[PDB]
Amino acid sequence: NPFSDHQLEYPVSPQDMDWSKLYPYYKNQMTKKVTIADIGCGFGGLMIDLSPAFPEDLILGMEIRVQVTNYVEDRIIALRNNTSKHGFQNINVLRGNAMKFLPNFFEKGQLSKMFFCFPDPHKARIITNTLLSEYAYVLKEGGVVYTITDVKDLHEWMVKHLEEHPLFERLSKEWEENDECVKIMRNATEEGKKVERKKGDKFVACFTRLPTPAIL
Numbered sequence: 001n002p003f004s005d006h007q008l009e010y011p012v013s014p015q016d017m018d019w020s021k022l023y024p025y026y027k028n029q030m031t032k033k034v035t036i037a038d039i040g041c042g043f044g045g046l047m048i049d050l051s052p053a054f055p056e057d058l059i060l061g062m063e064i065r066v067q068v069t070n071y072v073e074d075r076i077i078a079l080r081n082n083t084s085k086h087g088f089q090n091i092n093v094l095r096g097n098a099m100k101f102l103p104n105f106f107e108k109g110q111l112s113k114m115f116f117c118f119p120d121p122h123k124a125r126i127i128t129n130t131l132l133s134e135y136a137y138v139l140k141e142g143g144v145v146y147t148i149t150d151v152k153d154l155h156e157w158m159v160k161h162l163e164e165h166p167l168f169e170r171l172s173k174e175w176e177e178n179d180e181c182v183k184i185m186r187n188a189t190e191e192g193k194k195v196e197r198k199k200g201d202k203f204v205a206c207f208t209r210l211p212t213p214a215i216l
């Protein structure tokens with residue numbers, strides 16, 4: 001019953017995407033896939049910091065504002081230029097609305113990490129468990145959703161729906177405290193550096209994408 005949305009006769013495939021233009025350095029064919037996604041990345045700070053931490057992972061920021069994504073593109077081109085032969089070659093940005101069906105972008109289980117760093121607290125579609133189900137679809141079993149905000153109400157709203165969904169399980173404080181991504185995530189971004197200035201609080205919460213029960 002509760003997992004019907006995830007045991008599918010006709011699972012979808014992504015639309016055609018020339019990832020080689022975003023990560024030409026892995027053009028043999030394409031050598032890797034995007035495995036880390038920064039949803040609503042803003043000016044790209046998180047990606048910049050994750051880049052060296054995860055030199056083997058391709059990292060993609062998705063940003064709905066074209067002004068910001070046009071800017072971020074010039075920024076990572078600068079970072080590549082001013083840099084060894086692999087520097088910042090594993091990050092790029094994409095103009096897109098993450099609420100418009102992520103399975104158009106990524107294969108099933110493609111991603112190991114999804115970051116929602118200081119999301120703004122329903123034009124294209126209403127926010128629902130269905131959205132979280134689309135996130136679960138593109139997220140590997142064992143993958144993690146990383147969540148941080150200064151807005152207690154947004155924090156509690158995200159937590160409420162993530163724990164309601166049957167494919168997400170909250171990770172402990174201990175897990176968070178020993179995780180390098182939580183550390184980076186806390187102050188990698190302009191909005192995060194803002195909040196500490198305002199003496200604000202940083203509400204973190206992380207979830208594992210549970211394995212889907214087997215159907216056969």
Ligand SMILES: C[S@@+](CC[C@H](N)C(=O)[O-])C[C@H]1O[C@@H](n2cnc3c(N)ncnc32)[C@H](O)[C@@H]1O
Binds near residue numbers: 063065096097189
């Ligand atoms: C509050 S800002 C946080 C920016 C950055 N993540 C940080 O921590 O500094 C949220 C960003 O997500 C973008 N955004 C809002 N809704 C989005 C959506 N539906 N899809 C993709 N990006 C979105 C906004 O343009 C904004 O830049």
